[PDB]
Amino acid sequence: HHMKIDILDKGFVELVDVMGNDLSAVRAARVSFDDEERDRHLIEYLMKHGDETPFEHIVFTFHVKAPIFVARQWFRHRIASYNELSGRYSKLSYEFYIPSPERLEGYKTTIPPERVTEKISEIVDKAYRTYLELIESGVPREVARIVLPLNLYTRFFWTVNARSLMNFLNLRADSHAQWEIQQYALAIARIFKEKCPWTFEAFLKYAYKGDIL
Amino acid sequence: HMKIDILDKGFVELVDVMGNDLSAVRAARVSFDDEERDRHLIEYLMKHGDETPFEHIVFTFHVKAPIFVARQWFRHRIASYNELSGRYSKLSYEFYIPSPERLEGYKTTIPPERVTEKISEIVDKAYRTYLELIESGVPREVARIVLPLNLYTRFFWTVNARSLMNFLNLRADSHAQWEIQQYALAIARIFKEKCPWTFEAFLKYAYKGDILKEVQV
Amino acid sequence: HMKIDILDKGFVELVDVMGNDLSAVRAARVSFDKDEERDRHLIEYLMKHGDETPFEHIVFTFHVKAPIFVARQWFRHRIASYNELSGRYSKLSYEFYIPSPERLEGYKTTIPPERVTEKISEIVDKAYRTYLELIESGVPREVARIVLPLNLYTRFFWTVNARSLMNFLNLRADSHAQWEIQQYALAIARIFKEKCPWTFEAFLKYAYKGDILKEVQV
Amino acid sequence: MKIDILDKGFVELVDVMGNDLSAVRAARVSFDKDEERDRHLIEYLMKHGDETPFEHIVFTFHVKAPIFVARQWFRHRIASYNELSGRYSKLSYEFYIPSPERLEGYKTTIPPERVTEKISEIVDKAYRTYLELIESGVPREVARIVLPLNLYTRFFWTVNARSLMNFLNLRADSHAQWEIQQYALAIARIFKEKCPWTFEAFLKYAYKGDILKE
Numbered sequence: 129h130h131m132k133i134d135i136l137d138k139g140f141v142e143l144v145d146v147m148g149n150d151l152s153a154v155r156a157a158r159v160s161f162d163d164e165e166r167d168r169h170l171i172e173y174l175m176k177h178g179d180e181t182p183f184e185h186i187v188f189t190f191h192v193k194a195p196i197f198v199a200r201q202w203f204r205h206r207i208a209s210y211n212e213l214s215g216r217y218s219k220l221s222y223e224f225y226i227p228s229p230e231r232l233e234g235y236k237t238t239i240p241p242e243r244v245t246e247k248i249s250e251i252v253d254k255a256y257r258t259y260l261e262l263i264e265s266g267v268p269r270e271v272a273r274i275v276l277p278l279n280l281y282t283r284f285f286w287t288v289n290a291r292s293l294m295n296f297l298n299l300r301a302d303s304h305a306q307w308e309i310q311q312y313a314l315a316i317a318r319i320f321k322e323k324c325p326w327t328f329e330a331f332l333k334y335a336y337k338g339d340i341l
Numbered sequence: 342h343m344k345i346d347i348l349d350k351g352f353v354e355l356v357d358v359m360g361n362d363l364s365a366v367r368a369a370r371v372s373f374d375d376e377e378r379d380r381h382l383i384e385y386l387m388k389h390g391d392e393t394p395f396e397h398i399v400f401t402f403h404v405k406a407p408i409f410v411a412r413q414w415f416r417h418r419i420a421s422y423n424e425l426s427g428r429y430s431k432l433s434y435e436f437y438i439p440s441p442e443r444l445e446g447y448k449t450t451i452p453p454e455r456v457t458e459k460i461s462e463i464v465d466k467a468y469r470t471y472l473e474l475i476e477s478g479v480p481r482e483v484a485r486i487v488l489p490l491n492l493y494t495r496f497f498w499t500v501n502a503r504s505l506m507n508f509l510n511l512r513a514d515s516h517a518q519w520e521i522q523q524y525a526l527a528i529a530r531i532f533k534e535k536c537p538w539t540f541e542a543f544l545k546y547a548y549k550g551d552i553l554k555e556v557q558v
Numbered sequence: 559h560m561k562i563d564i565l566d567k568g569f570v571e572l573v574d575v576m577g578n579d580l581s582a583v584r585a586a587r588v589s590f591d592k593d594e595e596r597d598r599h600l601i602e603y604l605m606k607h608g609d610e611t612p613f614e615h616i617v618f619t620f621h622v623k624a625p626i627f628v629a630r631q632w633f634r635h636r637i638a639s640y641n642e643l644s645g646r647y648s649k650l651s652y653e654f655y656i657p658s659p660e661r662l663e664g665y666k667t668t669i670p671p672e673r674v675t676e677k678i679s680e681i682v683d684k685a686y687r688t689y690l691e692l693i694e695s696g697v698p699r700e701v702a703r704i705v706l707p708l709n710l711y712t713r714f715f716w717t718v719n720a721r722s723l724m725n726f727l728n729l730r731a732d733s734h735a736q737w738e739i740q741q742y743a744l745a746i747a748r749i750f751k752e753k754c755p756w757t758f759e760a761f762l763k764y765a766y767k768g769d770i771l772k773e774v775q776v
Numbered sequence: 777m778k779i780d781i782l783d784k785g786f787v788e789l790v791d792v793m794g795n796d797l798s799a800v801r802a803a804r805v806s807f808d809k810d811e812e813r814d815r816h817l818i819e820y821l822m823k824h825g826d827e828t829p830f831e832h833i834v835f836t837f838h839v840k841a842p843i844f845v846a847r848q849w850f851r852h853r854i855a856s857y858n859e860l861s862g863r864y865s866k867l868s869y870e871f872y873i874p875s876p877e878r879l880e881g882y883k884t885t886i887p888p889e890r891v892t893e894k895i896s897e898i899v900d901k902a903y904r905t906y907l908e909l910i911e912s913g914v915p916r917e918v919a920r921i922v923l924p925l926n927l928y929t930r931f932f933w934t935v936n937a938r939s940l941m942n943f944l945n946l947r948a949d950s951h952a953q954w955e956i957q958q959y960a961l962a963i964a965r966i967f968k969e970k971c972p973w974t975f976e977a978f979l980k981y982a983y984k985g986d987i988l989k990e
């Protein structure tokens with residue numbers, strides 16, 4: 129099981145593992161009441177009637193590289209398991225999300241988009257050089273890192289079941305979410321679709337509350 | 342699929358699993374940006390109480406157990422369950438009848454075989470009543486209320502290895518009811534087979550119960 | 559005190575509550591300090607737009623007496639805390655739910671409803687008798703009890719936040735749920751409404767998925 | 777009840793449901809006294825690891841903390857969080873600047889007072905860049921990504937006493953970052969005030985950390 133989607137300038141969402149498939153929900157559901165067409169139909173039935181427990185039996189592990197401001201929003205999803213790169217224990221790499229100029233179109237900035245991008249690059253560089261200077265000076269990493277900006281990239285593993293993934297997408301795959309987290313949500317959705325096509329289609333048709341998928 | 346028989350009619354069966362010991366290693370290694378190195382990290386993790394990397398190992402079991410066992414089991418909230426429904430299915434004539442040997446250590450007034458026999462009789466009376474009620478048109482969801490707590494039920498249980506260790510701490514232990522201890526022994530056997538390093542680590546550094554140190558696999 | 563009788567020997571009792579509607583408003587705004595129309599409008603906005611995290615800051619503790627078959631459905635609600643009456647910290651008692659004849663009227667049975675009641679009562683009586691006999695003979699109660707029917711009453715404390723309570727109502731205050739647990743959920747709703755009227759009205763207006771609370775006062 | 781933490785931080789108690797006797801009532805399952813026997817039950821529960829009764833005591837705190845502290849805190853999943861968002865209320869911009877004493881015990885190339893200064897300098901320049909972006913029409917959600925991890929945020933945290941004890945095990949400990957230990961000590965103090973018997977039995981039998989005994 130492997131898929132990797134690149135996101136933003138340096139980010140990604142990578143599928144590490146998966147347990148089960150659409151039929152894992154069918155099998156869990158069928159236990160209640162003690163054929164391809166009827167199995168597809170049952171998935172559509174569960175989704176329509178809001179019986180989402182059978183989808184908890186499908187599980188994913190992702191490996192994600194995202195800016196801290198993205199990761200912070202993401203880790204609000206409590207029904208999941210995380211392990212994240214540590215700024216207390218690791219020397220942090222010079223990797224920051226610098227938005228492209230096209231990210232500001234629609235907005236009428238009094239300076240050109242290219243200069244916004246550059247100003248972001250500049251402050252980031254200054255902050256990172258300060259962080260290094262502090263570390264080289266003997267300041268512990270856990271203190272030195274507090275000067276680094278929220279666009280610093282972090283990495284995490286994320287284990288999450290299909291039900292929680294549907295909740296995650298209802299919130300994040302939506303135009304009211306910040307564009308950057310939308311991009312990550314589209315990548316999660318794309319992988320979900322690949323691995324669980326019937327669940328994903330049913331989700332879209334019956335349960336999905338957002339407007340971008 | 343690994344299937345272990347438990348009690349007179351029960352079982353624990355492994356349906357699926359995601360990951361293995363290395364899945365915990367991979368997840369732990371992310372913090373800080375070889376076999377005996379990897380196995381050493383598992384022990385270190387367990388020794389210092391960082392159980393989060395073990396959440397990335399996930400099992401699905403299919404379990405057949407008496408309702409009284411299932412009700413205890415289902416108290417474990419950090420897990421997913423789907424169970425056979427007495428509202429929606431006619432229920433099978435299957436009930437846990439304790440063996441005579443279940444009743445020793447206990448000074449009783451009637452022989453253990455008599456205890457066994459009186460349990461059987463009540464089971465048989467209740468099931469016959471249940472069948473009569475269904476035949477008379479009583480909806481299943483009402484008719485089943487007369488059935489005893491030793492009725493067998495069936496469920497799928499999806500659970501990560503951290504939560505499985507919690508479960509073992511509470512149920513693979515002499516304070517737990519003997520019947521659920523038996524199920525927790527089978528759960529432990531399957532955990533050990535799929536996750537040997539995590540399992541040996543758990544036993545050596547974090548397991549809080551008594552029997553898994555006493556009783557092989 | 560609020561205690562509502564349910565079924566023949568059941569009940570829902572309110573033990574404690576943290577917060578009120580304004581606990582959700584304060585949490586949404588992250589402000590520890592009142593403007594009724596504004597605060598009520600925010601409750602509705604949150605509910606309409608599916609931002610239910612603020613409602614997690616209101617919490618209830620109930621004491622419920624219910625038959626085991628109801629409890630097994632109820633305890634499937636994992637986002638909550640339960641303590642069930644065990645025989646380790648308090649005395650156990652033995653009572654059972656015997657459906658009334660009217661529970662079956664509207665079902666074509668080949669025996670009168672009263673005979674159903676009698677047959678249920680009869681088996682309950684024999685099972686209880688077997689149980690007592692086993693106990694009196696030295697059989698430990700964890701084994702003796704396995705003969706007892708699923709209509710045996712149990713009791714539990716349930717601590718649950720308003721968001722999770724609303725999820726419980728969606729599934730249980732609904733004609734697809736078993737009638738018995740419907741009756742419990744109507745009592746839960748009555749209490750929730752009493753304590754959190756604005757949240758409860760907004761819930762029914764924008765988020766509630768069931769049928770019965772829109773038909774049945776309280 | 778409010779306790780100030782760091783230079784501009786705080787923890788304040790917003791609400792509480794229950795007290796020590798709420799655990800006692802849950803354990804016995806009885807809505808309907810004896811100090812001695814009730815305390816004994818609390819100790820008995822704690823020493824045998826039966827922590828479910830403590831889930832029936834619940835707290836709401838209001839916390840002001842730097843983002844790097846909040847990221848660690850929000851990893852506690854068995855709890856409810858609401859974080860300050862500009863959608864429902866006014867944002868302000870303050871930053872945690874460490875005191876020179878925070879470096880004591882570290883032999884550093886530059887004086888601790890100069891470390892402090894270098895931190896204030898970046899905060900200042902990052903904040904100034906943020907305001908320049910905002911004034912030029914960059915949306916806030918983009919402009920803010922240049923702000924440092926010491927930026928203060930605020931949140932409401934609703935947590936039951938069991939999950940609160942878990943939190944204290946991990947954060948009221950010398951292996952946890954100093955800054956979050958400080959907040960964990962405040963949480964502990966409020967917990968002790970409201971549930972003395974529970975808090976006492978926790979320290980005696982179940983608490984895994986070091987600092988609350990010191």
Ligand SMILES: Cc1cc2nc3c(=O)[nH]c(=O)nc-3n(C[C@H](O)[C@H](O)[C@H](O)COP(=O)(O)OP(=O)(O)OC[C@H]3O[C@@H](n4cnc5c(N)ncnc54)[C@H](O)[C@@H]3O)c2cc1C
Nearest residue numbers: 160181184291292423424426634635636637725729734735
């Ligand atoms: C009419 C009816 C018929 C039913 N028939 C059956 C049956 O045949 N068999 C059967 O087993 N059960 C059956 N159920 C029970 C049902 O499947 C659920 O177990 C129960 O209603 C709890 O739902 P919940 O998870 O939303 O509640 P909680 O378990 O309190 O969950 C509430 C919220 O938490 C989230 N959540 C909690 N844990 C997880 C998790 N691990 N993964 C993802 N999200 C999570 C969800 O977003 C949800 O909105 C039936 C229920 C009803 C109402």
Ligand SMILES: Cc1cc2nc3c(=O)[nH]c(=O)nc-3n(C[C@H](O)[C@H](O)[C@H](O)COP(=O)(O)OP(=O)(O)OC[C@H]3O[C@@H](n4cnc5c(N)ncnc54)[C@H](O)[C@@H]3O)c2cc1C
Nearest residue numbers: 211212214372393396419503504851852853854946951952
């Ligand atoms: C000194 C220290 C160093 C740390 N270093 C790192 C690091 O390098 N990287 C990193 O990512 N994190 C790190 N952490 C964070 C830590 O690993 C946990 O994320 C955090 O402490 C939450 O733990 P918890 O799951 O018990 O709390 P909650 O998340 O509130 O969970 C509480 C309880 O519920 C159970 N539980 C809850 N959810 C689940 C679940 N999904 N599966 C199984 N059981 C569950 C647990 O058994 C636990 O007893 C560190 C923490 C400390 C204190």
Ligand SMILES: O=c1ccn([C@H]2C[C@H](O)[C@@H](COP(=O)(O)O)O2)c(=O)[nH]1
Nearest residue numbers: 212213214215216847848851952953
């Ligand atoms: O002491 C620690 C170290 C890391 N974490 C968590 C918090 C974040 O999700 C990551 C990284 O935190 P950091 O403070 O950068 O090491 O892991 C923690 O909760 N406590």
Ligand SMILES: O=c1ccn([C@H]2C[C@H](O)[C@@H](COP(=O)(O)O)O2)c(=O)[nH]1
Nearest residue numbers: 412413414416517518642643644645
């Ligand atoms: O050993 C025990 C005893 C009770 N419980 C739980 C399960 C039920 O919800 C109640 C009552 O269980 P009982 O087996 O009736 O004592 O408490 C348990 O999980 N383990």
Ligand SMILES: O=c1ccn([C@H]2C[C@H](O)[C@@H](COP(=O)(O)O)O2)c(=O)[nH]1
Nearest residue numbers: 424425426427428630631634735736
């Ligand atoms: O309406 C229902 C039907 C089943 N369940 C759950 C409760 C048990 O775990 C199983 C079987 O319950 P039963 O009441 O036998 O259908 O599924 C439920 O919660 N609600």
Ligand SMILES: [Cl-]
Nearest residue numbers: 764765766767
């Ligand atoms: Cl609706």
